[PDB]
């Protein structure tokens, strides 16, 4: 069919291209075979559908179903309120969610995904990096208030308040308040910081001197163990039975009769 430039079936609507239809009030369908179906909706490009109020579809084969939703690029889906899909093959099924990049799925409340092939199903969580996808997602972030940065990381359901900066870290169920640092690291308890695994261990370098006192929660360096300054002399002297030199030069605390016998 020849292109047509006229009004649509709604009030103050406009269709511009080939086989376009605008059905809402103040709607715009520009391009090839686009569909705008609600109030104040815009469909620009090739075969774009806008079904939500104030929803925008811009590009190739995009869908904008939620209210105040935006789909920009190649084959993006926005479903909930204030949800944004930007790039190639992104879907956002959470309120106030953001999917940016290649093949990212977000289904939590106020969650963000940036990169390639991650799924975030937790609330107030975030993903930065790369995963895998072969029909189903194989690395997900299922914890609440947890964040992941890297490649091929996983957080289970029921494990909350976790932070991962590394590769190939898998946190199991029942672990809370933990931090994992490094590549190929493992976490197996709550309220811990891990810098390695049971097969490979790392060293912490360039550490300042702590305080040696009764109540001091500071790390200790090698020089402090080498020198021994600032320790409790009495505790070490009664932990290890020591005969003090001043009490040895002047005979003190001896059993006299036993020294009579041998001598």
């Amino acid at each position: 069919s020849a292109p047509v430039f006229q009004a649509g079936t709604g009030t103050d609507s406009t269709v511009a291209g080939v086989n376009n239809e605008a059905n809402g009030e103040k709607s715009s369908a520009f391009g090839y075979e686009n569909k705008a179906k609600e109030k104040l909706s815009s469909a620009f490009g090739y075969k774009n559908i806008a079904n939500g109020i104030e929803g925008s579809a811009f590009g190739i084969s995009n869908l904008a179903k939620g209210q105040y939703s935006s789909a920009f690029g190649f084959r993006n889906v926005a479903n909930k309120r204030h949800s944004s899909a930007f790039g190639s093959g992104n879907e956002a099924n959470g309120e106030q969610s953001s999917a940016f990049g290649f093949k990212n799925t977000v289904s939590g409340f106020n969650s963000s995904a940036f990169g390639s092939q991650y799924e975030v199903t937790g609330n107030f969580s975030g993903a930065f990096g790369m995963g895998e996808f072969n029909g189903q997602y194989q690395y997900k972030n299922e914890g609440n208030n947890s964040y992941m940065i890297g490649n091929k990381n996983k957080i289970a359901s029921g494990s909350n308040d976790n932070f991962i900066l590394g590769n190939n870290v898998h946190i199991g169920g029942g672990i809370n308040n933990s931090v994992a640092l490094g590549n190929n690291s493992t976490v197996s308890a709550s309220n811990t910081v891990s810098v390695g695994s049971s097969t490979l261990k790392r060293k912490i370098v360039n550490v300042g001197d702590g305080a040696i006192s009764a109540n001091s929660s500071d790390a200790v360096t090698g020089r402090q163990l080498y020198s021994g300054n600032g320790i409790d002399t009495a505790a070490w002297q009664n932990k290890l039975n020591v005969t003090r030199k001043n009490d040895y030069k002047d005979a003190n605390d001896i059993d006299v009769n036993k020294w009579k016998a041998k001598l």
Binding site: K103, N134, G135, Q138
Partner: protein
Amino acid sequence: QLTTESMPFNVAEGKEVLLLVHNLPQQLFGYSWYKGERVDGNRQIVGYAIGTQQATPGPANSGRETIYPNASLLIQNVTQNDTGFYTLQVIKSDLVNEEATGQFHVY
């Protein structure tokens, strides 16, 4: 049309079952094998990714299913609980999907 063929249709209680695919489209992205008639997350056996040339088992794997890089499935030491329907999903380079169904019964 994408087609799936079982060989043999009727199998013994200890032999091997092989499922082959004919008319596989070009320029694909990955494969995935399921159990039953529907594509379900909890009922996936194994999947393959062409970008990284990787194979990864799914939640419904027992240790007897092997995938080959031509969308072919091998099952060893079959029992009477392995009889029925199977589903194959093919993802293309444009992110569109295709489905196929196979079947076999064990005596």
